[PDB]
Design a binder for this molecule. Structure first.
Ligand SMILES: Nc1ncnc2c1ncn2[C@@H]1O[C@H](COP(=O)(O)OP(=O)(O)O)[C@@H](O)[C@H]1O
Ligand SMILES: Nc1ncnc2c1ncn2[C@@H]1O[C@H](COP(=O)(O)OP(=O)(O)O)[C@@H](O)[C@H]1O
Ligand SMILES: [Mg+2]
Ligand SMILES: [Mg+2]
Lengths: 343, 323
């Protein structure tokens, strides 16, 4: 061995909510933070079946704080992008479990803001602290819905963008818009406009956002004179992904979710198996995040109630598979696509 | 009735002349056209030419625009229609000049004060009619509404809806105005309040939307008509962009206009588009003023404005007397 890297997988179980309490659902999910374990009871108990237990890199219970999640699990990933790695954070699980609460949270609120806005603060504070380093940060924001890509930052919300792929390039979204951002205020405003554009259709956003994938992309370039006196540029891409609801697995089947499951499963079956990246826009776009040149963290969001036990178990099984995925991340050094080369 | 669209091109300024920029915008009042030429000329490339309801060059005076374009709109509000006039275009092109103008020279007064004069002189001449005129003044900045007339400038107001009359700004202050002097005072009060909290007033006013609202009730079977006149001065208007001019209300405005002219209209997506819902495809007459500058330096933004304005001409409204 040479001192590759596993996809990091964490589970977060949200509090039982008022609707669930009012319906008298039982709490069947138990989280053991010390052991990094989640146990799921059968709603009929051991009179029917024994409980299922899973182990993860870390687990977070109903009392987990947004900022502690951040510092323990997400910060090192963001750190890596600040040093020129590609990094991906994705939230997976059933509608209503807390993917968006985890990814976006309550912006403007330091206690309740999620990983995206925490990453903004981390990134720009890091930049302002640095010396003898030049940074350029820019953001894109896109939605995948019905296997088409919509640029949430574009003035034209009717156009759909195509994925292209070259040996020079890797896969990329052709003609995707990007905003250069110099501060937290600027990148927050980028997210505001994308979120506003996201609702351009009639279907209520609760339903629409459940049925689509949102990907916020922070590209961080850094230029610094090395000990060899040469100007070295590194470029890392931080993909921050809030997936469609995991229950959506004919038109009810989300093809990017289904492809994601097959990719995860193929990557960990222990065989030389075909990995079907091309079977969806999501898995094509995130190909490096799943077996490739990136560091990746998966947050598997679940809720505690007996009523949702089946979807919870589905989530936990995929999460348990994903933790065996091996990536091979590298610092992305002096790439041809670097805007900082202009200066 | 279609949204009326006019273009106004300001004079070349001193800095532009000093930098030796070419004048690339030509205006033909006879054809109602504006032409953007290549400095290399027609042996190289043809000008981009657009047609509008009216066009006004750098020499056109405030009162020419008023009597030709704005007056019929204000006439309609005096007859019980909703009417809207909005100024759109690049920062520095003349939106504010057109809407507010400059007080000290009567000839330089913009559509807002000119409308005051027209409305109150009309009312003073009226036989067999009773008018009541009310004014409100608000700003939209960062998708929040500030009442420019309230004492507390830290408060923000929500939009609510009534089942018959539609959207309104909850708790917005409204002054009854009996004269030009009273309504001008309301404008002066609001324009003072606008700079409250601004780090740079010119940048702030370029990034926000100002909406002066005149509600004209007329009593004259007993008829009561009510028409709302919205007078709007908008924010300035891999694909790499800069985050600093992001304007959430303008984004929404674009999506609304696109959906209206394509052959769901997302009015609810922003404060501006909810307030302007009637003005854009609804129960109002509407005039758009597309402001542009003449210099070669700004040509791409000028063209973007003209294309935007060209599309807006296609919006179909359904104005009724509100009786
Ligand atoms: N850890 C948590 N603590 C408190 N409230 C939460 C938590 N996770 C989710 N919620 C709440 O539950 C609701 C559903 O969460 P959301 O993130 O929208 O679900 P989805 O997984 O569908 O995006 C929201 O009202 C959100 O505030
Ligand atoms: N038609 C015009 N004639 C003369 N000066 C003008 C005209 N339009 C604008 N200006 C002047 O040009 C400058 C910028 O105009 P302004 O209305 O402030 O632009 P905007 O509101 O579009 O940013 C101001 O000094 C203004 O008085
Ligand atoms: Mg969600
Ligand atoms: Mg102005």
């Amino acid at each position: 061995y040479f001192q590759s890297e596993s996809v990091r997988v964490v589970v977060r179980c949200r509090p039982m909510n008022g609707k669930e309490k009012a319906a008298s659902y039982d709490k069947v999910v138990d989280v053991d933070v010390k052991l990094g374990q989640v146990s799921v009871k059968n709603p009929k108990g051991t009179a029917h079946e024994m409980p299922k237990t899973f182990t993860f890199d870390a687990v977070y219970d109903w009392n987990a704080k947004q900022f502690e999640l951040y510092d323990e699990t997400f910060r090192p990933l963001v750190d890596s992008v600040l040093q020129g790695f590609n990094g991906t954070i994705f939230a997976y699980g059933q509608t209503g479990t807390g993917k968006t609460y985890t990814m976006e949270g309550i912006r403007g609120d330091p206690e309740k803001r999620g990983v995206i806005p925490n990453s903004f603060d981390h990134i720009f504070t890091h930049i302002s602290r640095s010396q003898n380093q030049q940074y350029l940060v820019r953001a894109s924001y896109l939605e995948i819905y019905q296997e088409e890509i919509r640029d949430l930052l574009s003035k034209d919300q009717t156009k759909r963008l195509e994925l292209k792929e070259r040996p020079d390039t890797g896969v990329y979204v052709k003609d995707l818009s990007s905003f250069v951002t110099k501060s937290v205020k600027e990148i927050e405003h980028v997210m505001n406009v994308g979120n506003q554009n996201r609702s351009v259709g009639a279907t209520n956003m609760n339903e629409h956002s459940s049925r689509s994938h949102a990907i916020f992309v922070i590209t961080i370039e850094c230029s610094e004179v090395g000990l060899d006196g040469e100007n070295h540029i590194r470029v890392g891409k931080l993909n921050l992904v809030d997936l469609a609801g995991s229950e959506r697995q004919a038109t009810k089947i989300n093809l990017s979710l289904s492809a994601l499951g097959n990719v995860i499963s193929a990557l960990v079956d222990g065989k030389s198996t075909h990995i079907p990246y091309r079977d969806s826009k999501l898995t094509r776009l995130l190909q490096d995040s799943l077996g490739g040149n990136a560091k990746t963290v998966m947050v598997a969001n679940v809720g505690p109630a007996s009523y949702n036990v089946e979807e919870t178990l589905t989530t936990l099984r995929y999460a348990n598979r994903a933790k065996n995925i091996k990536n091979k991340p590298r610092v992305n050094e002096d790439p041809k696509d670097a805007l900082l080369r202009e200066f």
